[PDB]
Structure formats: structure tokens, C-alpha cells
């Protein structure tokens, strides 16, 4: 059918407003929910329906700044929300010590990402503190953790680290050699990329791996042509109509981006079947409340609404900005970032 | 029916 | 102790044991974004959680408070971390915690924080005795649960429990030969034990797979395994495979088989085989068969593959 654009703009608007206690489990990931909504509006060219200034202040209130003594550098970055109870501070005063307050790699990523989308120039971001915190998250094997206190480690966070270094236009945030090693070691016998060595190759980790390399500008340098051909084969085999994340698994709207974006980075998305993909994505569109779901006749959420739209974007949907396949922001935004970077270089 | 990525 | 849904539940603000603590509220400032509304009970538990956290109070009451915080939201990684801090400080019985997390994971098998918690516990105890069985149960409500398989590989690798995994794999593959997770597990076991260099093993595996393919010819997983264990040694270095496949084509055909064939032919052209120009034609003929009738959805891809072979071997 058709793309209910306005319906989706309202949907994202509501996401930025208030949610039912039913979404309590997203408390520590509120910043990424914000990202889905903001980048989603950006992708639909509707950022005007929100107060960029208010939101920018809220975001900055989530930054874990270094304290006076700077004894918490290894823990700087961004929080997913204010759940710890720290007094609201839009990165105005120095950081207030707290035994358990520290950033989360996915939040530092979506946070910076949101700031750029909203037009902020990142001047209030303590770049060095963030990079210091990032470094602290990398393990001996090259992968990353989400928080300094410890957590699981895998490709998801390698991608987060890559995006952070890229946006701050400084790769001192990671030991790139070790990260690349981790990404190579994750390639499966079936040629896809898994969350880690030995694990089942997966659409999500393949995107994270490939996108990370592209962000480092080392795709061609890390994988041979023969290897890239094998990876391309694995990826393009994911299309059933829409895309699934693993062989013999049902399709899921968000993979239209995870896999689709990987195919785009590998310059072969053009050889996929657009109609069946578009048709599937639209079949998961909630015509009443707006947004998209993973499967048709399923409830919509911010993640699928966003990735479903980015999926449509990949095929240049009428009414949607082109999405930067590696950075996960609109090309328009990736551009403003380019200018921003030039600015600093003076 | 969702995707908990975090 | 006092369950959150107990008729006699009492807000922490009304509990005597908590009178000395000032609850700490959360504040999103002037204009909150993506604000979640919380019930009295919910906000109450967390206002006290913030209080205890802020003071890094390693008390028994704090430990009990985390149970409630977790019941309200098991996705709060900070709560689990603090709970681990307390588990140590109060030297709690870890075998008991194992029962706790076992119940939690069963209710929320797709939660990252709970699987991480269990892994930390197992490391602490250095006891993997109940892991394989626990995971097998979780895999019963979802044989493809990525968290379960990941945890399973960690345990097996960390405590070297390879002895029975290949058998577990054979069993699951019988339950559903299309489970891509099980095929990956099979490769995981073998490559970490015998390896595939033992021609006896390679032969057993190729034979095993061809058998599974014959039972269900349309199975990407089986084909990917077969190509996976041979692609690096050179697909063209196996003359009898090319023919055994061409013999299947008649009855057990599928786009996966045709694809395998194209791949064999390309390996040949890659190794300057005999009949360069003739082989390339056999390839191109298949590419087109894929594009026009066998794997139409990838029509443009296959034609792209074909054009690639032509401009590379002519
Ligand atoms: C916030 C943001 C944009 C982060 C980007 C970096 C991340 C976290 C990427 C995650 C990609 C991804 C789709 C990972 C897989 C998530 N799962 C749902 C894993 C295990 O659960 P299953 O139910 O087996 O998943 P599946 O959906 O693959 O069947
Ligand atoms: Zn999804």
C-alpha cells in the first residue's frame, strides 16, 4: 500500500512525550528511544515539530562529566536516563561524584548522535573524557563492554565504539588494530559475521562489523575480494521478501536496515528485489497508531518504526531522506557532521 | 513481539 | 520476603526499618523526554534504591531491596551490578543465587543482564555442573535463542566440556534439521576438538551433511555447512563431489545446490582448470538458471555474478 508519513511523525512525537508504565524496562535506554524518535523525525524531515533546545538540554543532563579531581575519567560518557537520581545538570557545572554513576557505550553513541541531529555543535561534550571512558571499555580481544563496572561484550559495542570515535573524529578512543582483529575472528564458516568468534553469524553483528570497518575506512584492507564476495553472498541470501537475521529464521522488519544497510555498504543492495522488501516493510505498518512492527499484525515500537523507515530510505522512498548506511543518521546529518569536523580543524 | 537489542 | 503483590505489602516509605533513609527522587529537569510514568509502588522502590545506591550501603536490607527492584525491572544493569557487590560484601550463598537467577532467566530468556549475571556467578563458583542442562531447558522454549547458545559455548569452552556436545547436536538436528544454530554448534564442537584436517573426519562430516541434505534438500544451513568445511581447502579439489551433486540435481534440486555448483565451477576457473572457456559456460548457464527460474528474487544478483565471471575469465 502507501506510506502513512504523517501518521509516523505523530508516532515519533508521542515517543518523545510520555510513556505508560508498561515501558518501564526501557528506563535505562531512554536515550536510545529518543534517538529512534529524533533520527526518525529527521529522516521524515519533521524535526520542526519538537523543541530542539529543550531536548538538547535534557541530553546534556545525561553526560557523565569528570569531577573536580578528575578521578572518574574512566567512567565518563552518557547515561541512558536520570534513573540514578543525580540532580539535573545540563553539563553546566562539574561532575558530582557518585559510587555508581558512569556512562554506557550505547548511550554515549546515541547521545552524541542525537546532539548532532538536533544541530548542537558538541561544544559542551568533554571529548577527551568520553574517549578516556571509551578506551576503558575495550577488552584484550578487541571487543567492548557497555559499562566500566562490567557487562557482556560483543560486536554490538564494537560498532558503538566505532560510531563514537567517528563522530568525535578521533580514534584514540580505541585500539583499532585489536578491534579489527575481533571483527575478523567473528567471521563464520558460512561467511557471515557473528557476535563473536565461533558464534552463529547474524545479520545484526554482520552490520555492526562491516559498518565499523567502513567507519574506520578499512573494509577493503581487512577482507580480501574473495572474502567480501563470500560475505556479500551471505548477506544477499537473507532476503526472503523482507529480511531475516539468520538462515531459516522468519523475516523481521528491522533487518531491512541491518542487512540492507550492509548490502548498501558492500555496493550490491542495488541487486536486491526492492518491491518485495518494500511490500513486506509496509505490511508491518500500523495504519492506526503509526510506526512499524517486526511482523505484520503485531504491535509497533520505536525501534521497528525507525529501522523500517531507514529500510524504506535505502530504496529512496518518496518522502524519506537518504540514510547514511554506516552511521545510522540521515545523510543530511552526516553532512552537518562533516562541516562540524572541518570547523574544529583550524 | 519485539527486539531487545540492549 | 514481602512480595510486591502481597496483600500486606508496605511501601518502603512506611517501613520502620527504613525510617533513617531519605528517599532520593529522579528528576529529568524542566522538560522531560521519553518520560515513563511510574506507579506509587514502583517509584517508591526505586526512590529507596537510589538512596541506598548513593550511599553505597552494603546492608542486608539493601540486598532485599534489589530483589524488588529487579522484579520491577530486570533490565536495569545497575541494579544487578549493585546486587553482585552485595553478594560479595554480605558473603551470600551463591548456590542460592543460582536458583534465583535460574528462575529469572526462565521468565525472561531474552534479557541481556540476566544472562550476564549467571555467567558471573558460574565464574565465581567455578562450577558448570548444572549449565548444560539448564541451557537445554531454555533451548526447549526457543531452540534458536541466541543468548542460550552464546552462554552454552562459553561454558563448554571455559570448562572444556566437549565430550557430549556433538551428540547433543545430532539429537537437536534430528528434532529440526533446519535449525541454523545447531549447525553452527556442530562446527563449533568439531573445529575445537578434532578439527577438519583429519580426512577421516572431513569425510564423515561431508557424508553426514549429504545425508541431511537428501532428507531435506531445501535447507540453506546444511548447504552452508557443507560449503563451509570445504571452501578453504578448495571446492575444485574434490572431483567426486562435483559429480555426486550433479547426480542429485535431478531429484534433490534446490537453488542452494545450483549455487554450490556455480561455486565449484568458479573455484576451477580460479585454478586455471582444463576447458577454461567451457567451464565458464557451465557456470553462466547455471547463474541464468538461478536468475530466471530457481532463485528469482535474487535475479539481478545472479546476473551480476554471471557478468563478473565473464569479465574475469575470457
Ligand atoms: C541503539 C543502537 C542503534 C544500537 C546499535 C548497536 C546494536 C546494539 C545493534 C544490535 C543488532 C542486533 C539486531 C542484535 C541481535 C538482537 N537479539 C534480539 C539477540 C538474541 O535474541 P534472538 O531472539 O535470538 O534474536 P533474533 O531477533 O536475531 O532472532
Ligand atoms: Zn526486529
XYZ file of C-alpha atoms and ligand atoms in Angstrom:
696
model
C 0.000 0.000 0.000
C 1.148 3.534 0.791
C 3.477 5.138 3.298
C 1.430 6.894 6.011
C 4.122 9.520 6.608
C 2.132 11.911 8.831
C 0.932 9.031 10.953
C 4.582 8.127 11.629
C 5.514 11.702 12.502
C 2.819 11.719 15.182
C 4.044 8.336 16.413
C 7.589 9.633 16.962
C 6.202 12.796 18.550
C 4.368 10.708 21.132
C 7.517 8.659 21.831
C 9.321 11.839 22.899
C 6.443 12.739 25.198
C 5.164 10.316 27.824
C 5.028 6.536 28.020
C 2.827 4.072 30.031
C 4.477 2.286 32.979
C 4.356 -0.669 30.601
C 7.639 0.582 29.111
C 9.490 0.726 32.419
C 12.048 -1.756 31.120
C 13.326 0.929 28.746
C 14.179 3.328 31.587
C 17.948 2.867 31.262
C 17.704 3.046 27.456
C 15.519 6.130 27.180
C 18.238 7.995 25.312
C 18.230 5.405 22.525
C 14.423 5.583 22.396
C 14.878 9.337 21.959
C 17.365 8.624 19.168
C 14.854 6.385 17.382
C 12.274 9.156 17.560
C 14.543 12.107 16.762
C 16.517 10.431 13.973
C 13.181 9.083 12.815
C 11.688 12.568 12.585
C 14.901 13.765 10.970
C 14.550 11.003 8.362
C 10.992 12.236 7.684
C 12.178 15.854 7.651
C 9.962 16.857 10.617
C 12.400 17.907 13.337
C 10.463 21.155 13.411
C 7.678 19.524 15.464
C 9.925 19.419 18.534
C 11.771 21.944 20.669
C 15.385 21.196 19.767
C 16.671 23.398 22.603
C 14.788 21.651 25.399
C 15.803 18.232 24.174
C 19.439 19.289 23.777
C 19.485 20.354 27.430
C 17.964 17.072 28.535
C 20.603 15.162 26.608
C 23.445 17.162 28.109
C 21.973 16.444 31.539
C 22.789 12.797 30.794
C 26.525 13.388 30.330
C 28.767 11.915 32.995
C 31.320 14.711 33.293
C 34.659 14.325 35.033
C 34.677 15.502 38.635
C 36.894 18.259 40.060
C 39.736 15.834 40.828
C 39.074 14.049 37.515
C 39.348 10.675 39.271
C 36.387 9.338 37.279
C 37.696 9.774 33.731
C 37.407 6.038 33.050
C 33.681 6.338 33.631
C 32.710 9.328 31.526
C 30.286 9.233 28.622
C 26.478 9.371 28.687
C 23.694 7.807 30.797
C 20.552 6.328 29.288
C 18.426 8.394 31.682
C 18.358 10.072 35.089
C 17.358 6.919 36.967
C 20.300 7.255 39.401
C 18.810 10.339 40.979
C 21.626 12.740 40.189
C 20.498 16.406 40.263
C 19.654 17.809 36.818
C 22.736 19.444 35.308
C 22.873 20.167 31.529
C 26.665 19.831 31.503
C 26.880 23.256 33.128
C 28.744 22.517 36.373
C 31.484 19.938 37.062
C 30.525 16.333 37.697
C 29.133 15.339 41.093
C 30.782 12.182 42.468
C 28.632 9.050 42.782
C 29.819 5.478 43.520
C 27.790 4.019 40.663
C 27.343 6.752 38.078
C 29.085 6.156 34.769
C 28.323 6.105 31.068
C 27.002 3.350 28.840
C 28.619 2.931 25.426
C 25.286 2.667 23.562
C 24.142 5.847 25.286
C 27.334 7.780 24.559
C 26.761 6.737 20.952
C 23.045 7.572 20.657
C 23.624 10.661 22.782
C 26.265 12.246 20.538
C 24.212 11.085 17.589
C 21.135 12.918 18.937
C 23.070 16.112 19.631
C 24.286 16.224 16.019
C 20.805 15.510 14.672
C 19.442 18.399 16.753
C 22.069 20.810 15.450
C 24.215 21.098 18.573
C 27.941 21.553 17.914
C 29.147 19.234 20.705
C 30.990 22.101 22.387
C 29.665 21.000 25.781
C 30.843 17.436 25.207
C 34.033 16.657 27.120
C 35.535 14.852 24.131
C 38.656 13.718 25.997
C 36.639 12.367 28.919
C 34.400 10.398 26.566
C 37.402 8.981 24.705
C 39.042 8.092 28.018
C 35.877 6.284 29.074
C 35.669 4.517 25.712
C 39.245 3.246 25.941
C 38.437 1.780 29.351
C 35.712 -0.383 27.821
C 37.883 -2.277 25.325
C 38.962 -5.821 26.182
C 42.161 -7.723 25.359
C 40.403 -9.407 22.424
C 39.491 -6.060 20.870
C 35.763 -6.050 21.658
C 33.989 -3.716 24.086
C 31.839 -3.714 27.207
C 28.957 -1.288 27.667
C 29.895 -0.039 31.150
C 33.123 0.184 33.193
C 31.562 -1.880 36.004
C 31.429 -4.777 33.568
C 28.929 -6.359 31.192
C 28.715 -8.788 28.312
C 30.972 -7.929 25.358
C 30.329 -8.331 21.637
C 30.051 -6.795 18.181
C 27.173 -4.506 19.193
C 29.542 -2.466 21.341
C 32.367 -2.572 18.795
C 30.000 -0.707 16.485
C 29.152 1.760 19.252
C 32.823 2.486 19.882
C 33.374 2.945 16.154
C 30.498 5.436 15.858
C 31.749 7.387 18.863
C 35.310 7.676 17.547
C 33.953 8.629 14.144
C 31.629 11.363 15.417
C 34.258 12.793 17.751
C 36.523 12.438 14.721
C 39.222 10.921 16.935
C 40.145 7.243 17.059
C 42.247 7.430 20.198
C 39.097 6.054 21.790
C 40.063 2.518 20.760
C 42.941 0.253 19.757
C 41.798 -0.116 16.165
C 44.202 -2.949 15.445
C 42.661 -5.118 18.173
C 39.112 -4.177 17.185
C 39.757 -5.194 13.576
C 41.161 -8.472 14.841
C 37.938 -9.103 16.756
C 35.838 -8.329 13.678
C 37.842 -10.727 11.502
C 37.695 -13.515 14.083
C 33.906 -13.251 14.158
C 33.512 -14.418 10.569
C 31.732 -17.778 10.475
C 32.299 -20.802 8.261
C 29.153 -19.729 6.390
C 30.818 -16.352 5.846
C 28.534 -14.092 7.841
C 29.776 -12.221 10.914
C 28.725 -13.385 14.398
C 28.626 -11.537 17.714
C 31.958 -13.151 18.473
C 34.264 -15.931 17.308
C 32.600 -19.326 16.998
C 29.096 -17.942 17.416
C 26.332 -18.176 14.788
C 26.723 -15.497 12.105
C 23.919 -12.948 12.386
C 22.507 -10.002 10.434
C 22.909 -7.642 13.366
C 26.541 -8.456 14.078
C 27.366 -8.520 10.357
C 26.055 -4.973 10.062
C 27.969 -3.940 13.174
C 31.183 -5.470 11.882
C 31.020 -4.244 8.298
C 29.784 -0.776 9.305
C 32.585 -0.472 11.869
C 35.201 -1.263 9.241
C 33.623 1.195 6.802
C 33.619 3.828 9.528
C 37.353 3.151 10.010
C 37.761 3.167 6.240
C 39.393 -0.262 6.306
C 36.823 -2.555 4.683
C 38.962 -3.323 1.614
C 42.095 -3.540 3.747
C 40.694 -6.118 6.189
C 38.786 -8.505 3.925
C 40.063 -9.902 0.627
C 37.962 -9.643 -2.515
C 37.222 -13.363 -2.191
C 36.158 -12.795 1.405
C 33.966 -9.810 0.567
C 32.302 -11.886 -2.144
C 31.511 -14.574 0.388
C 30.154 -12.025 2.865
C 28.059 -10.434 0.100
C 26.641 -13.845 -0.734
C 25.690 -14.496 2.886
C 24.034 -11.109 3.195
C 22.024 -11.181 -0.014
C 20.806 -14.676 0.888
C 18.986 -13.077 3.824
C 16.207 -11.704 1.610
C 13.061 -13.858 1.597
C 10.759 -10.927 0.718
C 11.696 -8.816 3.694
C 14.892 -9.809 5.512
C 15.632 -12.236 8.328
C 18.703 -12.062 10.583
C 19.770 -15.707 10.239
C 19.231 -18.604 7.806
C 15.898 -20.367 8.430
C 14.568 -17.609 10.706
C 11.388 -15.611 9.969
C 11.801 -12.147 8.401
C 11.768 -9.105 10.643
C 11.294 -5.504 9.522
C 14.400 -4.155 11.273
C 16.611 -6.402 9.153
C 15.600 -4.415 6.088
C 18.084 -1.987 7.589
C 20.588 -4.227 9.404
C 21.165 -6.388 6.328
C 20.029 -3.855 3.727
C 22.499 -1.280 5.001
C 25.276 -3.898 4.948
C 24.426 -4.712 1.334
C 24.500 -0.976 0.595
C 27.936 -0.650 2.170
C 29.042 -3.622 0.050
C 27.678 -1.846 -3.029
C 25.254 -4.596 -4.023
C 21.975 -3.558 -2.382
C 21.079 -2.421 -5.887
C 20.827 -6.074 -6.923
C 18.190 -6.980 -4.337
C 14.460 -7.110 -5.056
C 13.038 -3.736 -3.947
C 9.327 -4.401 -4.386
C 9.059 -7.457 -2.144
C 11.157 -5.731 0.503
C 9.075 -2.538 0.415
C 5.891 -4.580 0.391
C 6.946 -6.523 3.463
C 8.003 -3.423 5.399
C 4.700 -1.719 4.636
C 2.779 -4.828 5.686
C 4.067 -4.230 9.222
C 2.945 -0.605 9.224
C 0.327 0.201 11.877
C -2.169 2.271 9.872
C -3.971 3.332 13.048
C -1.307 4.390 15.570
C 1.599 4.712 13.150
C 5.082 3.220 13.312
C 6.110 -0.299 12.275
C 6.297 -3.715 13.947
C 8.690 -6.619 13.404
C 5.892 -8.684 11.850
C 2.562 -7.772 10.271
C -0.435 -7.556 12.615
C 1.977 -7.079 15.517
C 2.302 -4.027 17.779
C 4.595 -1.195 16.621
C 7.538 0.164 18.588
C 10.125 2.925 18.204
C 12.866 0.545 17.060
C 10.930 -1.014 14.200
C 9.318 2.284 13.288
C 12.796 3.780 12.919
C 14.513 0.872 11.184
C 11.513 0.219 8.977
C 11.764 3.809 7.803
C 15.539 3.552 7.314
C 14.869 0.357 5.375
C 12.496 2.250 3.086
C 15.114 5.007 2.837
C 17.659 2.545 1.474
C 15.376 2.241 -1.587
C 14.825 6.030 -1.710
C 11.195 6.057 -0.554
C 9.213 9.107 -1.722
C 9.259 11.385 1.282
C 12.235 10.000 3.245
C 15.770 11.372 3.437
C 18.588 9.070 2.350
C 20.123 7.379 5.370
C 23.883 7.104 5.861
C 24.194 3.260 5.961
C 27.211 3.150 8.272
C 26.498 5.993 10.694
C 22.768 5.350 11.090
C 21.822 9.042 10.780
C 20.388 10.906 7.774
C 22.900 11.808 5.024
C 21.878 15.405 5.685
C 23.052 14.899 9.274
C 26.205 13.021 8.293
C 26.976 16.104 6.224
C 26.431 18.605 9.011
C 28.894 16.398 10.903
C 31.440 16.749 8.077
C 31.202 20.545 8.343
C 31.410 20.346 12.103
C 34.642 18.360 11.781
C 36.132 20.854 9.307
C 35.258 23.609 11.807
C 37.347 22.076 14.571
C 40.251 21.685 12.111
C 41.573 25.265 12.375
C 6.921 -9.255 19.956
C 9.997 -7.029 19.903
C 13.776 -6.918 19.590
C 15.634 -6.215 22.819
C 18.980 -5.079 21.451
C 20.262 -3.895 24.833
C 10.355 -11.877 51.872
C 7.468 -9.375 51.490
C 6.254 -9.910 47.931
C 5.356 -6.882 45.788
C 1.886 -8.238 45.189
C 1.274 -9.427 48.767
C -1.958 -8.189 50.414
C 0.225 -6.976 53.266
C 2.867 -5.242 51.153
C 4.007 -1.935 52.636
C 5.673 0.936 50.798
C 9.278 1.439 51.904
C 8.341 4.988 52.952
C 6.085 3.342 55.577
C 8.581 0.736 56.806
C 10.203 1.241 60.197
C 13.483 -0.431 59.172
C 13.809 2.289 56.525
C 12.919 5.358 58.591
C 16.547 6.543 58.770
C 16.932 6.709 54.990
C 15.812 9.704 52.930
C 14.466 8.504 49.587
C 16.161 10.048 46.540
C 13.899 11.055 43.646
C 14.767 11.029 39.955
C 14.486 14.330 38.082
C 14.516 14.782 34.299
C 14.605 18.547 34.589
C 12.244 21.214 33.114
C 11.154 19.309 30.019
C 11.415 15.510 30.299
C 11.900 13.463 27.118
C 10.593 9.905 26.689
C 9.330 10.044 30.248
C 7.876 6.839 31.652
C 5.094 7.211 34.211
C 5.522 5.110 37.340
C 3.046 3.781 39.893
C 3.367 4.645 43.572
C 4.830 1.229 44.351
C 7.319 1.412 41.508
C 8.542 4.913 42.257
C 8.713 4.010 45.932
C 11.019 1.017 45.468
C 13.355 2.980 43.217
C 13.422 6.118 45.334
C 14.849 3.958 48.095
C 17.089 2.104 45.666
C 18.641 5.436 44.631
C 19.118 6.269 48.295
C 20.916 3.037 49.142
C 22.999 3.257 45.945
C 24.055 6.841 46.511
C 25.372 5.821 49.928
C 26.840 2.556 48.694
C 25.199 0.900 51.688
C 26.280 -2.753 51.791
C 23.373 -3.848 54.006
C 21.123 -6.884 54.173
C 18.101 -4.625 53.738
C 19.656 -3.215 50.561
C 20.173 -6.739 49.263
C 16.474 -7.457 49.791
C 15.550 -4.158 48.136
C 17.320 -5.233 44.930
C 15.036 -8.235 44.676
C 12.091 -5.850 44.422
C 13.893 -3.511 42.038
C 14.678 -6.481 39.816
C 11.082 -7.692 39.938
C 10.034 -4.235 38.784
C 12.696 -4.059 36.068
C 15.203 -6.836 35.382
C 16.735 -4.797 32.553
C 18.326 -2.306 34.941
C 22.005 -3.276 34.710
C 22.994 -1.035 37.626
C 20.673 -2.925 39.966
C 22.289 -6.238 39.018
C 25.787 -4.816 39.470
C 24.951 -3.493 42.934
C 23.349 -6.830 43.767
C 26.627 -8.544 42.830
C 28.567 -6.090 45.002
C 26.241 -7.026 47.874
C 26.500 -10.748 47.137
C 30.212 -10.417 47.871
C 30.084 -7.918 50.760
C 27.469 -9.971 52.603
C 29.098 -13.238 51.531
C 25.729 -14.614 50.401
C 25.237 -18.254 49.472
C 25.910 -18.289 45.736
C 24.269 -21.662 45.229
C 21.088 -19.927 46.370
C 21.627 -17.074 43.925
C 21.969 -19.686 41.179
C 18.426 -20.841 41.918
C 17.252 -17.247 41.853
C 18.808 -16.370 38.509
C 17.663 -19.706 37.109
C 14.052 -18.748 37.777
C 14.537 -15.189 36.477
C 16.066 -16.290 33.171
C 13.230 -18.745 32.598
C 10.774 -15.864 32.813
C 12.969 -13.507 30.750
C 15.137 -15.631 28.432
C 15.919 -12.702 26.111
C 17.263 -10.307 28.731
C 20.980 -9.462 28.392
C 21.528 -8.527 32.047
C 20.255 -11.836 33.472
C 22.480 -13.976 31.254
C 25.444 -11.829 32.162
C 24.617 -12.235 35.858
C 24.507 -16.017 35.564
C 27.820 -16.075 33.742
C 29.485 -14.068 36.504
C 28.090 -16.462 39.116
C 29.327 -19.531 37.281
C 32.784 -17.926 37.025
C 32.737 -17.224 40.760
C 31.668 -20.749 41.660
C 33.904 -22.356 39.027
C 31.008 -24.811 38.902
C 29.496 -25.574 35.472
C 27.777 -28.755 36.670
C 24.235 -27.535 36.002
C 24.819 -25.329 32.964
C 24.367 -27.696 30.023
C 21.092 -28.986 31.429
C 19.788 -25.513 32.235
C 20.554 -24.284 28.735
C 18.946 -27.373 27.195
C 15.749 -26.428 29.022
C 15.841 -22.830 27.852
C 16.522 -24.079 24.331
C 13.287 -26.001 24.717
C 11.148 -22.887 24.680
C 13.271 -21.477 21.809
C 15.860 -23.648 20.090
C 17.387 -20.549 18.465
C 17.702 -18.257 21.486
C 20.991 -16.503 20.718
C 21.627 -15.817 24.437
C 21.320 -19.520 25.256
C 23.706 -20.669 22.533
C 26.202 -17.965 23.443
C 26.164 -18.976 27.096
C 26.434 -22.629 26.093
C 29.551 -22.037 24.021
C 31.102 -20.027 26.830
C 30.563 -22.814 29.354
C 31.781 -25.566 27.071
C 34.906 -23.603 26.136
C 35.682 -22.299 29.631
C 35.366 -25.650 31.416
C 36.285 -27.873 28.464
C 33.006 -29.802 28.331
C 33.200 -31.051 24.732
C 32.670 -34.757 25.470
C 28.908 -34.854 24.825
C 28.161 -31.815 22.701
C 28.490 -33.488 19.303
C 25.869 -35.976 20.491
C 23.602 -33.169 21.725
C 23.924 -31.620 18.269
C 22.959 -34.868 16.490
C 19.898 -35.038 18.692
C 18.745 -31.485 18.013
C 19.416 -31.774 14.291
C 17.004 -34.707 14.300
C 14.359 -32.558 16.000
C 14.762 -29.837 13.367
C 17.405 -30.177 10.673
C 16.722 -26.558 9.691
C 17.958 -25.045 12.953
C 20.902 -22.926 11.810
C 22.047 -22.565 15.429
C 22.586 -26.304 15.782
C 24.619 -26.499 12.574
C 26.815 -23.731 13.910
C 27.175 -25.617 17.184
C 28.290 -28.686 15.266
C 31.053 -26.740 13.541
C 31.939 -25.192 16.913
C 32.466 -28.598 18.550
C 34.387 -30.254 15.748
C 36.680 -27.331 14.978
C 37.550 -27.092 18.674
C 38.276 -30.778 19.113
C 39.410 -32.971 16.206
C 39.416 -30.199 13.616
C 38.631 -30.884 9.948
C 42.150 -31.723 8.752
C 41.694 -35.376 9.628
C 40.470 -36.670 6.270
C 38.547 -39.311 8.203
C 36.591 -36.578 9.995
C 36.096 -34.399 6.925
C 34.725 -37.445 5.107
C 32.396 -38.307 7.996
C 31.101 -34.744 8.088
C 30.629 -34.335 4.339
C 28.836 -37.670 4.296
C 26.712 -36.694 7.282
C 25.667 -33.455 5.632
C 24.894 -35.001 2.238
C 22.637 -37.364 4.165
C 20.804 -34.498 5.842
C 20.566 -32.689 2.514
C 18.934 -35.767 0.966
C 16.328 -35.759 3.747
C 15.533 -32.059 3.317
C 17.201 -30.739 0.119
C 15.928 -27.205 0.633
C 17.970 -26.230 3.690
C 20.423 -23.347 3.463
C 22.009 -24.336 6.796
C 23.068 -27.791 5.646
C 24.437 -26.417 2.378
C 26.320 -23.644 4.161
C 27.976 -26.174 6.468
C 28.980 -28.390 3.541
C 30.462 -25.447 1.640
C 31.949 -24.066 4.836
C 34.117 -27.051 5.700
C 35.372 -27.374 2.112
C 35.625 -23.859 0.666
C 39.006 -23.165 2.185
C 40.671 -26.395 1.119
C 39.355 -25.741 -2.393
C 35.988 -26.891 -3.746
C 37.556 -27.964 -7.050
C 39.981 -30.263 -5.220
C 37.097 -32.719 -4.702
C 36.268 -34.288 -8.110
C 33.772 -36.823 -6.735
C 31.730 -34.078 -5.066
C 31.026 -32.290 -8.319
C 29.569 -35.477 -9.782
C 27.685 -36.625 -6.694
C 25.963 -33.232 -6.730
C 25.211 -33.275 -10.461
C 23.534 -36.634 -9.746
C 21.334 -35.102 -7.056
C 20.256 -32.229 -9.318
C 17.610 -34.444 -10.963
C 15.650 -35.224 -7.777
C 17.031 -33.179 -4.846
C 17.489 -29.889 -6.732
C 17.288 -26.507 -4.997
C 18.833 -23.073 -5.526
C 21.384 -23.997 -2.836
C 22.641 -26.915 -4.929
C 22.811 -24.853 -8.144
C 24.664 -22.196 -6.186
C 27.112 -24.753 -4.842
C 27.753 -25.900 -8.419
C 28.407 -22.341 -9.608
C 30.866 -22.025 -6.733
C 32.653 -25.251 -7.674
C 32.987 -24.067 -11.283
C 34.351 -20.735 -10.173
C 36.940 -22.427 -7.995
C 38.022 -24.340 -11.105
C 38.282 -21.227 -13.284
C 40.200 -19.784 -10.331
C 42.741 -22.604 -10.550
C 43.254 -22.435 -14.338
C 41.449 -25.738 -14.919
C 41.095 -27.620 -18.208
C 38.446 -26.154 -20.553
C 38.547 -22.630 -19.129
C 36.046 -21.389 -21.741
C 33.834 -24.467 -21.425
C 33.567 -24.393 -17.625
C 32.744 -20.676 -17.609
C 29.783 -21.542 -19.837
C 28.559 -24.223 -17.458
C 28.715 -21.584 -14.727
C 26.958 -18.837 -16.666
C 24.297 -21.348 -17.710
C 23.595 -22.004 -14.027
C 23.722 -18.354 -12.985
C 20.981 -17.670 -15.511
C 19.017 -20.724 -14.377
C 19.113 -19.209 -10.896
C 18.119 -15.711 -12.072
C 15.344 -16.821 -14.441
C 13.809 -19.767 -12.561
C 15.468 -21.096 -9.374
C 16.225 -18.062 -7.178
C 14.287 -15.319 -8.988
C 14.188 -12.970 -6.012
C 17.960 -12.660 -6.480
C 17.643 -12.351 -10.268
C 19.760 -9.197 -10.502
C 22.362 -10.627 -8.095
C 22.929 -13.782 -10.106
C 23.145 -11.843 -13.379
C 25.683 -9.647 -11.616
C 27.593 -12.773 -10.589
C 27.469 -14.029 -14.169
C 28.750 -10.770 -15.674
C 31.526 -10.973 -13.072
C 32.609 -14.418 -14.189
C 32.639 -13.413 -17.872
C 34.802 -10.333 -17.446
C 37.157 -12.388 -15.245
C 37.671 -15.493 -17.397
C 37.600 -14.635 -21.126
C 20.756 1.812 19.868
C 21.502 1.305 18.675
C 21.073 1.927 17.376
C 22.446 0.372 18.785
C 23.261 -0.211 17.656
C 24.180 -1.298 18.143
C 23.386 -2.563 18.449
C 23.086 -2.734 19.927
C 22.976 -3.450 17.480
C 22.171 -4.710 17.750
C 21.871 -5.528 16.491
C 21.034 -6.770 16.730
C 19.788 -6.785 15.872
C 21.358 -7.767 17.621
C 20.521 -9.022 17.881
C 19.468 -8.813 18.994
N 18.818 -10.025 19.535
C 17.360 -9.909 19.548
C 19.594 -11.200 20.021
C 19.129 -12.538 20.630
O 17.713 -12.740 20.656
P 17.020 -13.553 19.452
O 15.503 -13.577 19.766
O 17.579 -14.934 19.256
O 17.205 -12.573 18.205
P 16.800 -12.604 16.706
O 15.955 -11.333 16.565
O 18.115 -12.415 15.960
O 16.054 -13.837 16.309
Zn 13.431 -6.566 14.782
